[PDB]
Design a protein around this ligand. Structure first.
Ligand SMILES: [Cu+2]
Ligand code: NA
Length: 105
């Protein structure tokens, strides 16, 4: 796959790793909708609002299968470690008007 998943479960915002590249989610938006990172970086989304959100990459984007991330409650977080350069678009499953991308370069 083009990204690995350190934790299939969401985890607490306080449990975010040093060195992770954080994208906050608030006001029904990914606060960094176009994030540029390097191969090997871990991106961590942190939900800062009451409304639950996830990240969802359709099949073929991060690998053969779709990656439908777990729903994050407020102050929960979720990581992906990107292993291959490319452009990886995602959306929020319940809120598909929320769109973002990670550009690994
Ligand atoms: Cu959402
Ligand atoms: Na909101």
């Amino acid at each position: 796959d083009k990204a690995t998943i350190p934790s299939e479960s969401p985890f607490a915002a306080a449990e975010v790793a040093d060195g992770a590249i954080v994208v906050d989610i608030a006001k029904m938006k990914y606060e960094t909708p176009e994030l540029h990172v390097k191969v090997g970086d871990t991106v961590t989304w942190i939900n800062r609002e009451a409304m639950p959100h996830n990240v969802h990459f359709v099949a073929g984007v991060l690998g053969e299968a779709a990656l439908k991330g777990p729903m994050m409650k407020k102050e929960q977080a979720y990581s992906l470690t990107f292993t291959e350069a490319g452009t990886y678009d995602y959306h929020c499953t319940p809120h598909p008007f929320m769109r973002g991308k990670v550009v690994v370069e």
